[PDB]
């Protein structure tokens, strides 16, 4: 489901805490975080603690598996997906449809020390920042009260390990989660049948934080959601709320005028593929040239670091995803973050 | 794994029983077979009985689920996948990798009476005919004796039911099977980890039986298998063993010279998608214009019936898939079907 945001709603998107900004949320992610390593545990527990302190009404959960990789020999490498969710009160969680926002928090193993600032530390911080901004509005609109909640998934083991293309290499966390949630059966009485079927919309963020991204629409079934996202971007650009673009900047959403039945782009293999293959509606927000399909220039090089991040672009992304989630959840009229007893 | 077929091996592909031909195997399939209907049970039990009588060394199994559809209201429609397999003797089945050949045996529900002769009755008969031809050779080569078996899957509920594009509509049987086999854990001691992981190669046949098919390569990870299939076709055409093409006929395999890293085609959503999303190597043999992506003209019309089937093309397909399976299983030198004590 979804609502419609007034221009006023769009001018009240930022969260009231100016001291906790995206650079602040991003910084502890910008470290090597290969699966199974100490850096993975440090980043994972940073994310969990962020939700536990700043978003205490959310429930956090981990989904754990292990798998051999092309470089692990006989040893199983563990993959730990991080799930956080918040549902409306006095609703059976098994009756809730979830807007589900996703990014991978693991980092590539080769070269040693690889940071992956756009891949996907910055996507992770965009999600974290955005759900922080909408949590206050969700509390307001649920205090006034429909059967939809909000969910984030930070996936482990997205990145492949082997030198050569191998079908079961990569997407370790997303394959395990989809596979497990597809067999997590609800009661017969519940509105939804499985934990997987309760995903109303899966939005996967990947390779964001570079300047001038190009975002194609890859799934007809979510092209309308794509067009809603592009509209919010356009409106924000007009109202001048975008820092990385002037009022006449080019739109990132190259397929925005394309007809759903005219969409002819090959999907990019990534974490949405296991979910999409089992029938989940997925929207894949990934920066990639729409024609060739080639990723940003820093992709999988040492230059994918903090110094090459565009923080104005990252702030625009956070605002855009906040606006998209607020529209989808129908938070129109509940975005005011002015503080009472303060002039 | 795989072997190499001599020109002699290619001249001995047909099965010794001339009275059981593809028209014979195909005919009982060419009837309405909507999931949950009496026609579905009649076709399903025809297939099971075919394996049980003509291929008695194979084990047959059914995977059963049920699901609501856009047109079933509150009622669950059952979906019954048919599995048959044969593994080398004195091998733990849990240590076997499977060449897995697939087609859907359900038929479209609208319009009433739809036959789907290419979609996919003829694919089903191609598989049935081919594994019949290679079963005798498998017995010969296993009597002489490596860790690979042969498997067929006739999927139910491929076809979608709703008027409008819907993510969880369609692929009912393939989603359930992949989902269940992905959680079917073998013993720790077994060479393979799950029933899904034991699939070495999944070859999906769809929309075959029309003249002059065009078959693109859709998955880099199986492009070499694709090129092996195209080679066998070319060699067969040269040796004049192909009935639908002269020695200078055009090849069906349009991507045969294309470099694996130059493959830029959007996959066709179909039964291989759930498996591919969970890491199975899939080769998708489907007739479709390589550019537009549009299916044969009879697709989903009443003209997709027996009268529009090209039986020479169907016989060529059966020979080609027999040759491909025999190469993959390394049956070179074991294809002679001459009969002892007969001049
Ligand atoms: Zn990467
Ligand atoms: Zn069809």
XYZ file of C-alpha atoms and ligand atoms in Angstrom:
688
model
C 0.000 0.000 0.000
C 0.987 3.732 -0.102
C -0.107 7.371 0.433
C 0.778 10.795 -1.067
C 3.258 13.311 0.404
C 2.440 17.031 0.390
C 5.277 19.516 -0.337
C 5.128 20.343 3.404
C 5.760 16.676 4.298
C 8.825 16.827 2.014
C 10.240 19.878 3.835
C 10.137 18.056 7.218
C 12.099 14.875 6.309
C 15.389 15.328 8.295
C 15.433 13.779 11.817
C 15.534 16.240 14.780
C 19.018 15.061 15.953
C 21.527 17.194 14.031
C 24.448 15.729 15.973
C 23.764 12.188 14.628
C 24.369 12.764 10.857
C 25.111 10.298 7.991
C 28.917 10.783 8.307
C 28.523 9.843 11.999
C 26.431 6.713 11.173
C 28.649 5.790 8.229
C 32.071 6.119 9.869
C 32.069 2.908 12.007
C 31.123 0.914 8.849
C 34.144 2.027 6.821
C 36.446 -0.807 7.861
C 37.225 -4.271 6.459
C 34.300 -6.546 7.293
C 34.968 -9.874 5.557
C 32.591 -12.665 6.715
C 33.885 -14.670 9.665
C 36.533 -12.083 10.631
C 36.715 -9.823 13.697
C 35.824 -6.820 11.513
C 32.548 -8.526 10.575
C 31.633 -8.934 14.236
C 32.566 -5.353 15.073
C 30.468 -3.890 12.225
C 27.550 -6.264 12.898
C 27.419 -5.365 16.566
C 27.684 -1.652 15.714
C 24.564 -1.992 13.546
C 22.696 -4.036 16.197
C 23.599 -1.526 18.911
C 22.512 1.367 16.703
C 19.047 -0.121 16.430
C 18.961 -1.126 20.078
C 19.789 2.368 21.371
C 18.397 4.810 18.768
C 15.444 2.635 17.642
C 14.408 0.817 20.822
C 10.877 0.051 19.645
C 12.363 -2.167 16.886
C 13.028 -5.888 17.370
C 16.451 -7.068 16.112
C 17.203 -10.665 14.999
C 20.058 -12.578 13.380
C 19.784 -15.362 10.789
C 22.887 -17.566 10.915
C 24.194 -20.093 8.420
C 27.568 -21.384 7.327
C 28.935 -22.472 3.993
C 32.158 -23.569 2.348
C 33.547 -21.067 -0.131
C 36.004 -21.353 -3.056
C 38.777 -20.108 -0.718
C 37.837 -21.760 2.586
C 38.951 -25.319 1.752
C 37.332 -27.676 4.248
C 36.246 -24.904 6.664
C 32.744 -23.469 6.799
C 32.569 -19.670 6.810
C 29.652 -18.229 8.837
C 27.182 -15.760 7.331
C 25.056 -13.684 9.707
C 22.184 -11.615 8.344
C 20.893 -8.766 10.501
C 17.151 -8.160 10.605
C 15.353 -5.332 12.344
C 11.630 -4.639 12.224
C 8.851 -2.519 13.709
C 5.155 -3.367 13.352
C 2.004 -1.452 14.382
C 0.916 -2.114 17.959
C -1.756 -4.611 18.860
C -1.356 -6.292 15.484
C -0.393 -9.926 15.116
C 3.064 -9.776 13.579
C 2.047 -12.690 11.364
C -0.681 -10.423 9.849
C 1.751 -7.627 8.854
C 3.071 -6.838 5.393
C 6.613 -5.458 5.455
C 8.279 -2.739 3.474
C 11.750 -4.287 3.487
C 14.881 -2.230 2.913
C 18.151 -4.098 2.177
C 21.881 -3.609 1.699
C 24.880 -5.889 2.143
C 27.262 -5.153 4.994
C 29.994 -7.670 4.173
C 33.047 -6.506 2.243
C 35.040 -8.079 -0.595
C 37.952 -10.205 0.562
C 40.462 -9.506 -2.271
C 42.278 -7.086 -2.204
C 43.233 -7.158 1.496
C 41.947 -4.096 3.319
C 39.196 -3.371 0.761
C 36.741 -0.844 2.220
C 33.776 -0.819 -0.180
C 32.527 2.612 0.803
C 29.768 2.551 -1.870
C 29.723 -1.254 -1.789
C 27.791 -1.097 0.424
C 28.721 0.804 3.524
C 27.039 3.958 2.304
C 23.836 2.058 1.305
C 23.783 0.644 4.853
C 24.083 4.094 6.366
C 21.356 5.410 4.025
C 18.966 2.777 5.334
C 19.956 3.366 8.945
C 19.513 7.126 8.638
C 16.204 6.850 6.815
C 14.476 4.478 9.195
C 15.666 6.683 12.055
C 13.911 9.629 10.435
C 10.645 7.749 9.840
C 10.457 6.049 13.251
C 9.202 9.225 14.959
C 6.491 9.689 12.332
C 5.476 6.037 12.625
C 5.026 6.507 16.348
C 2.866 9.604 15.733
C 0.657 7.963 13.087
C 0.275 4.735 15.058
C -0.649 6.642 18.208
C -3.492 8.216 16.206
C -4.805 4.913 14.776
C -2.866 0.075 8.451
C -1.593 -3.520 8.407
C 1.991 -2.739 7.310
C 5.324 -2.571 9.102
C 8.893 -1.591 8.271
C 11.843 -3.966 8.051
C 15.540 -3.716 7.319
C 17.899 -6.528 6.353
C 21.660 -6.151 6.271
C 22.825 -9.169 4.328
C 26.106 -10.970 4.862
C 28.182 -12.702 2.239
C 26.896 -10.893 -0.818
C 30.349 -10.776 -2.373
C 31.735 -13.793 -4.196
C 35.111 -15.262 -3.183
C 36.385 -17.184 -6.201
C 38.472 -16.046 -9.142
C 36.039 -17.528 -11.635
C 32.275 -17.253 -12.154
C 30.562 -19.942 -10.072
C 26.823 -20.390 -9.651
C 26.771 -21.087 -5.883
C 29.482 -18.506 -5.050
C 28.141 -15.262 -3.641
C 24.785 -14.221 -2.202
C 25.399 -16.533 0.757
C 23.285 -14.551 3.206
C 20.444 -13.687 0.847
C 20.088 -17.276 -0.459
C 19.986 -18.650 3.150
C 17.480 -16.022 4.395
C 15.071 -16.385 1.465
C 15.392 -20.173 1.652
C 14.629 -20.166 5.458
C 11.847 -17.533 5.394
C 10.219 -19.437 2.515
C 9.864 -22.413 4.849
C 8.863 -20.368 7.933
C 5.137 -21.177 7.903
C 2.708 -18.936 9.776
C -0.484 -20.264 11.403
C -3.368 -21.086 9.081
C -5.326 -18.234 10.687
C -2.690 -15.611 9.796
C -3.262 -13.299 6.841
C 0.116 -14.303 5.358
C 1.353 -17.805 4.820
C 5.136 -17.646 5.286
C 7.624 -15.133 6.592
C 8.785 -14.676 2.976
C 5.279 -14.055 1.696
C 4.832 -11.208 4.209
C 7.428 -9.107 2.341
C 5.263 -6.515 0.557
C 8.126 -4.786 -1.228
C 11.880 -5.439 -1.074
C 14.038 -2.438 -1.915
C 17.702 -3.347 -2.344
C 20.270 -0.506 -2.188
C 23.700 -1.195 -3.721
C 26.706 0.776 -5.000
C 25.455 4.207 -3.875
C 27.571 7.153 -2.808
C 29.284 7.994 -6.056
C 28.405 11.143 -7.992
C 25.815 11.167 -10.761
C 24.388 7.664 -10.329
C 22.266 6.089 -13.031
C 19.388 3.944 -11.745
C 17.470 1.769 -14.187
C 14.192 -0.034 -13.538
C 14.822 -3.779 -13.689
C 11.537 -5.413 -12.628
C 8.222 -4.648 -14.369
C 6.301 -5.742 -11.324
C 7.818 -2.850 -9.295
C 8.057 -0.282 -12.100
C 5.262 1.756 -10.537
C 7.204 1.846 -7.263
C 10.217 2.918 -9.304
C 8.235 5.730 -10.859
C 7.006 6.817 -7.426
C 10.653 6.959 -6.240
C 11.663 9.029 -9.306
C 8.730 11.424 -8.748
C 9.799 12.070 -5.143
C 13.350 12.759 -6.444
C 12.048 15.187 -9.095
C 9.810 17.009 -6.592
C 12.691 17.246 -4.071
C 14.980 18.636 -6.807
C 12.367 21.300 -7.703
C 11.753 22.314 -4.055
C 15.580 22.721 -3.947
C 15.917 20.198 -1.084
C 18.603 18.267 -3.036
C 22.240 19.233 -2.352
C 23.916 17.304 -5.150
C 21.770 18.795 -7.957
C 20.635 22.216 -9.054
C 16.985 22.784 -9.902
C 17.819 21.806 -13.516
C 20.001 18.794 -12.695
C 19.469 15.595 -14.666
C 17.333 12.897 -13.019
C 19.076 9.766 -11.794
C 16.117 7.640 -12.803
C 16.711 7.003 -16.476
C 13.693 4.746 -16.981
C 11.193 7.097 -15.374
C 9.201 7.793 -18.561
C 9.565 4.260 -19.944
C 6.403 2.207 -20.214
C 6.262 -0.833 -17.948
C 5.698 -3.131 -20.970
C 8.664 -1.407 -22.718
C 11.181 -2.298 -19.957
C 13.946 -4.383 -21.542
C 16.890 -4.475 -19.143
C 18.793 -7.470 -17.879
C 18.787 -7.618 -14.068
C 22.073 -7.328 -12.205
C 22.825 -10.469 -10.197
C 22.742 -9.355 -6.524
C 20.940 -10.026 -3.234
C 17.420 -9.491 -4.642
C 17.757 -12.487 -6.994
C 16.967 -15.293 -4.467
C 13.949 -13.363 -3.178
C 12.705 -12.453 -6.664
C 13.053 -16.072 -7.765
C 10.776 -17.164 -4.945
C 8.092 -14.574 -5.843
C 9.021 -11.455 -3.812
C 8.374 -8.040 -5.379
C 11.845 -6.420 -5.573
C 13.021 -2.942 -6.533
C 16.780 -2.877 -7.221
C 18.352 0.545 -6.684
C 21.896 0.119 -7.993
C 24.164 2.591 -9.803
C 25.168 1.170 -13.174
C 25.374 2.481 -16.705
C 21.959 1.611 -18.188
C 23.453 0.378 -21.510
C 26.720 -1.506 -20.940
C 25.765 -2.425 -17.396
C 29.135 -1.340 -15.989
C 29.446 -0.238 -12.369
C 30.984 2.988 -11.001
C 34.668 3.356 -11.828
C 35.817 2.764 -8.239
C 33.938 -0.565 -8.129
C 36.123 -3.277 -6.561
C 39.246 -1.063 -6.583
C 41.045 0.525 -3.606
C 39.615 3.940 -4.662
C 36.193 2.829 -3.318
C 36.983 4.548 -0.027
C 35.722 7.451 2.032
C 37.723 10.002 0.042
C 35.839 9.153 -3.139
C 32.390 9.193 -1.514
C 30.203 12.162 -2.450
C 28.572 13.102 0.815
C 26.093 15.467 -0.825
C 24.907 12.599 -3.019
C 24.728 10.330 0.073
C 22.592 12.909 1.942
C 20.292 13.174 -1.095
C 19.906 9.384 -1.067
C 19.032 9.393 2.618
C 16.383 12.067 2.062
C 14.988 10.224 -0.980
C 14.690 6.862 0.764
C 13.094 8.575 3.766
C 10.525 10.164 1.462
C 9.855 6.891 -0.346
C 9.347 4.943 2.873
C 7.124 7.654 4.351
C 4.911 7.697 1.226
C 4.737 3.874 1.134
C 3.747 3.733 4.799
C 1.299 6.647 4.356
C 2.887 9.002 6.835
C 1.582 12.154 5.146
C 0.783 14.743 7.854
C 2.959 13.042 10.490
C 6.443 14.258 9.408
C 6.517 17.459 11.536
C 9.550 17.194 13.858
C 9.199 20.642 15.534
C 9.716 20.338 19.308
C 7.044 21.282 21.881
C 7.925 23.906 24.534
C 10.663 25.301 22.228
C 10.743 28.603 20.309
C 31.435 -33.691 -15.905
C 31.316 -34.822 -19.596
C 32.926 -36.921 -22.377
C 33.259 -36.695 -26.198
C 31.027 -38.471 -28.748
C 32.560 -40.048 -31.858
C 30.650 -39.757 -35.178
C 29.834 -43.474 -34.706
C 28.220 -42.748 -31.313
C 26.084 -40.116 -33.087
C 24.849 -42.630 -35.690
C 23.550 -45.002 -32.958
C 21.341 -42.563 -30.968
C 17.774 -43.846 -31.743
C 16.353 -46.417 -29.259
C 15.876 -50.006 -30.577
C 12.036 -49.893 -30.196
C 10.718 -48.459 -33.475
C 7.112 -49.046 -32.425
C 7.422 -46.621 -29.452
C 8.113 -43.320 -31.333
C 7.775 -39.643 -30.234
C 4.237 -39.328 -31.717
C 3.298 -42.375 -29.595
C 4.849 -40.867 -26.404
C 3.479 -37.405 -27.163
C -0.133 -38.301 -27.975
C -1.437 -39.001 -24.412
C -0.017 -35.589 -23.321
C -1.990 -33.564 -25.868
C -5.031 -32.942 -23.682
C -6.049 -30.195 -21.235
C -4.046 -30.681 -18.044
C -4.833 -27.707 -15.792
C -3.544 -28.174 -12.199
C -6.051 -29.798 -9.859
C -8.272 -31.110 -12.683
C -8.899 -34.698 -13.813
C -6.792 -34.063 -16.934
C -3.811 -33.242 -14.706
C -4.145 -36.572 -12.916
C -4.527 -38.502 -16.160
C -1.414 -36.929 -17.739
C 0.610 -37.230 -14.512
C -0.186 -40.904 -14.133
C 0.590 -41.501 -17.824
C 4.077 -40.062 -17.259
C 4.597 -42.054 -14.025
C 3.457 -45.273 -15.706
C 5.731 -44.613 -18.678
C 8.732 -44.514 -16.380
C 7.507 -47.433 -14.306
C 7.068 -49.762 -17.297
C 9.651 -48.639 -19.894
C 12.290 -47.403 -17.398
C 11.923 -49.786 -14.453
C 15.407 -49.162 -13.070
C 14.396 -45.522 -12.383
C 12.863 -44.399 -9.080
C 9.811 -42.108 -9.441
C 8.704 -39.575 -6.776
C 6.138 -36.797 -6.419
C 6.598 -33.456 -4.641
C 3.216 -32.086 -3.549
C 2.228 -28.604 -2.449
C -0.851 -26.429 -2.643
C -1.345 -22.728 -3.119
C -4.077 -20.162 -3.615
C -4.108 -18.598 -7.064
C -5.574 -15.348 -8.462
C -8.603 -17.357 -9.685
C -9.063 -19.896 -6.879
C -10.584 -17.555 -4.270
C -10.314 -19.236 -0.878
C -9.458 -22.696 -2.291
C -5.942 -24.089 -2.488
C -4.998 -25.587 -5.854
C -2.594 -28.565 -5.639
C 0.669 -28.662 -7.592
C 2.361 -32.034 -8.077
C 5.872 -32.191 -9.504
C 7.014 -35.488 -11.006
C 10.591 -36.586 -10.393
C 12.325 -39.605 -11.855
C 15.971 -40.529 -11.397
C 18.549 -43.251 -12.005
C 21.923 -43.367 -10.240
C 24.942 -45.678 -10.694
C 24.742 -48.871 -8.650
C 26.444 -49.279 -5.315
C 26.740 -45.514 -4.978
C 25.204 -43.594 -2.111
C 22.479 -41.554 -3.768
C 23.490 -38.655 -1.530
C 26.955 -38.719 -3.226
C 25.567 -38.391 -6.788
C 25.542 -35.302 -8.981
C 22.510 -35.154 -11.269
C 22.116 -34.065 -14.841
C 18.561 -32.769 -14.487
C 16.243 -32.393 -17.462
C 13.034 -30.340 -16.993
C 9.806 -29.327 -18.706
C 6.410 -28.237 -17.415
C 3.486 -30.595 -17.902
C 0.670 -28.329 -16.714
C -1.352 -26.405 -19.285
C -2.678 -22.836 -19.358
C -6.176 -22.465 -17.956
C -7.517 -19.663 -20.229
C -8.728 -20.273 -22.934
C -10.745 -23.381 -21.997
C -9.465 -26.460 -23.798
C -5.984 -24.999 -24.425
C -3.616 -27.786 -25.504
C -0.128 -26.246 -25.387
C 1.447 -28.701 -27.793
C 4.807 -26.839 -27.746
C 4.040 -25.467 -24.279
C 5.205 -27.919 -23.146
C 3.798 -31.246 -24.167
C 6.383 -31.700 -26.885
C 9.274 -30.735 -24.522
C 7.964 -33.401 -22.121
C 7.941 -36.021 -24.845
C 11.456 -34.978 -25.943
C 12.744 -35.643 -22.442
C 10.858 -38.917 -22.139
C 12.138 -40.169 -25.489
C 15.710 -39.104 -24.816
C 16.114 -40.698 -21.414
C 14.601 -43.871 -22.862
C 17.330 -43.900 -25.495
C 20.161 -43.319 -23.005
C 18.960 -45.781 -20.349
C 20.269 -48.793 -22.297
C 23.680 -47.163 -22.723
C 23.784 -46.241 -19.035
C 23.179 -49.867 -18.157
C 26.014 -50.942 -20.489
C 28.529 -48.387 -19.176
C 27.626 -49.008 -15.536
C 27.931 -52.765 -15.988
C 31.505 -52.149 -17.178
C 32.477 -49.870 -14.255
C 31.576 -41.924 -12.463
C 29.663 -40.247 -9.621
C 26.816 -38.819 -11.747
C 23.208 -39.809 -12.340
C 20.338 -38.698 -14.557
C 17.167 -36.984 -13.373
C 13.996 -35.657 -14.941
C 11.511 -33.225 -13.420
C 8.112 -32.519 -14.918
C 6.988 -29.376 -13.158
C 3.401 -28.491 -12.356
C 1.900 -25.038 -12.242
C 4.391 -23.241 -14.442
C 1.668 -21.172 -16.074
C 0.303 -18.091 -14.344
C -3.448 -17.745 -13.720
C -4.123 -14.030 -13.317
C -4.947 -11.385 -15.891
C -2.236 -9.075 -14.606
C 1.481 -9.489 -13.883
C 1.895 -10.690 -10.293
C 5.157 -11.670 -8.633
C 3.927 -14.808 -6.809
C 1.686 -15.986 -9.689
C 3.180 -18.771 -11.766
C 6.086 -21.158 -11.242
C 4.147 -22.813 -8.418
C 5.787 -26.212 -8.800
C 9.321 -25.004 -9.463
C 9.305 -22.530 -6.532
C 8.030 -25.276 -4.133
C 10.531 -27.919 -5.356
C 13.580 -25.638 -5.222
C 12.444 -24.293 -1.848
C 12.010 -27.882 -0.433
C 15.163 -29.404 -1.987
C 17.153 -26.419 -0.684
C 16.167 -27.457 2.835
C 16.593 -31.224 2.260
C 19.904 -31.656 4.100
C 22.065 -34.701 3.399
C 24.273 -36.318 6.066
C 27.486 -34.507 6.947
C 29.416 -37.448 5.470
C 27.770 -37.104 2.035
C 29.669 -35.444 -0.801
C 26.763 -33.027 -1.378
C 25.050 -30.949 1.236
C 21.421 -30.649 0.100
C 19.230 -32.272 -2.503
C 19.332 -28.950 -4.397
C 23.109 -28.758 -4.302
C 23.357 -32.202 -5.944
C 21.935 -30.786 -9.203
C 25.022 -30.617 -11.446
C 23.251 -29.079 -14.424
C 19.574 -28.193 -14.917
C 18.438 -28.137 -18.533
C 14.967 -26.648 -18.951
C 13.116 -27.344 -22.234
C 10.241 -24.992 -23.125
C 8.234 -23.973 -26.206
C 9.768 -26.556 -28.567
C 8.085 -28.207 -31.524
C 7.641 -25.249 -33.815
C 9.692 -24.889 -36.992
C 12.942 -22.939 -37.102
C 13.417 -22.284 -33.382
C 15.880 -19.686 -32.172
C 17.731 -20.619 -28.971
C 19.803 -17.983 -27.200
C 22.287 -18.555 -24.385
C 20.973 -16.858 -21.249
C 23.375 -17.867 -18.457
C 27.144 -17.275 -18.694
C 27.791 -19.996 -16.176
C 26.364 -22.616 -18.602
C 27.515 -21.022 -21.866
C 30.069 -23.785 -22.371
C 27.294 -26.368 -22.011
C 25.324 -24.318 -24.523
C 28.217 -24.401 -26.946
C 28.553 -28.162 -26.480
C 24.830 -28.532 -27.334
C 25.239 -26.353 -30.463
C 28.297 -28.376 -31.563
C 26.349 -31.649 -31.337
C 23.577 -30.008 -33.433
C 26.088 -28.817 -36.059
C 27.794 -32.230 -36.242
C 24.403 -33.997 -36.533
C 23.382 -31.592 -39.332
C 26.634 -32.341 -41.225
C 26.317 -36.141 -40.812
C 22.805 -35.605 -42.296
C 21.109 -37.150 -39.228
C 18.797 -34.099 -38.908
C 15.405 -34.334 -40.658
C 14.288 -30.731 -40.302
C 17.438 -29.215 -41.878
C 19.531 -29.768 -44.962
C 23.301 -29.975 -44.640
C 23.411 -26.174 -45.142
C 20.511 -25.312 -42.829
C 20.939 -22.424 -40.405
C 21.875 -23.316 -36.816
C 19.237 -22.864 -34.137
C 21.858 -21.753 -31.647
C 22.279 -18.079 -32.403
C 24.774 -17.383 -29.620
C 27.104 -20.246 -30.482
C 30.061 -18.052 -31.508
C 29.409 -15.381 -28.868
C 32.011 -15.006 -26.152
C 30.833 -15.914 -22.662
C 31.793 -12.430 -21.369
C 29.914 -10.902 -24.361
C 26.555 -12.529 -23.451
C 24.027 -9.734 -22.902
C 20.545 -11.253 -22.954
C 17.775 -10.853 -20.432
C 16.604 -14.231 -19.104
C 13.043 -15.342 -19.769
C 11.091 -15.795 -16.537
C 10.293 -19.546 -16.365
C 10.842 -22.625 -14.188
C 14.654 -22.288 -14.052
C 14.429 -18.955 -12.192
C 13.825 -20.322 -8.634
C 16.646 -22.843 -9.061
C 19.041 -20.307 -10.599
C 18.302 -17.860 -7.788
C 19.348 -20.454 -5.236
C 22.651 -21.188 -7.043
C 21.819 -24.018 -9.496
C 23.598 -24.045 -12.868
C 20.758 -23.773 -15.432
C 20.670 -23.995 -19.220
C 17.391 -22.625 -20.625
C 16.471 -24.092 -24.012
C 13.477 -22.019 -25.104
C 12.420 -20.865 -28.580
C 12.207 -17.078 -28.659
C 13.348 -14.356 -31.008
C 16.795 -13.393 -29.661
C 16.148 -9.620 -30.041
C 12.547 -8.740 -29.148
C 12.180 -11.778 -26.923
C 8.842 -12.765 -28.473
C 7.691 -16.382 -28.426
C 6.513 -18.530 -31.366
C 3.408 -17.165 -33.065
C 1.136 -19.935 -31.753
C 2.165 -19.150 -28.154
C -0.900 -19.075 -25.878
C -3.345 -19.256 -28.818
C -5.588 -22.173 -29.858
C -3.234 -22.823 -32.835
C -0.681 -24.315 -30.383
C -2.052 -27.773 -31.138
C -0.898 -30.998 -32.729
C -1.637 -29.768 -36.252
C 0.899 -26.966 -35.917
C 3.630 -29.157 -34.406
C 6.561 -29.900 -36.715
C 7.291 -33.537 -36.048
C 10.581 -33.475 -37.947
C 11.753 -30.647 -35.694
C 10.521 -32.602 -32.628
C 12.480 -35.712 -33.723
C 15.589 -33.552 -34.220
C 15.159 -32.209 -30.681
C 14.865 -35.712 -29.272
C 18.051 -36.779 -31.058
C 19.885 -33.623 -29.931
C 18.943 -33.970 -26.267
C 19.879 -37.658 -26.389
C 23.292 -36.721 -27.769
C 23.785 -33.979 -25.186
C 22.888 -36.239 -22.270
C 25.072 -39.065 -23.580
C 28.081 -36.724 -23.932
C 27.483 -35.216 -20.465
C 27.272 -38.668 -18.892
C 30.286 -39.887 -20.919
C 28.548 -42.693 -22.741
C 30.922 -42.645 -25.717
C 31.386 -46.239 -26.960
C 28.215 -47.514 -25.257
C 25.548 -46.286 -27.739
C 25.499 -49.410 -29.978
C 21.922 -50.774 -29.925
C 22.455 -53.674 -32.400
C 20.776 -56.851 -31.099
C 22.684 -60.081 -30.340
C 21.607 -63.292 -32.137
C 20.040 -61.183 -34.940
C 21.224 -60.700 -38.540
Zn 31.150 -5.526 -4.482
Zn 2.640 -21.114 -21.704
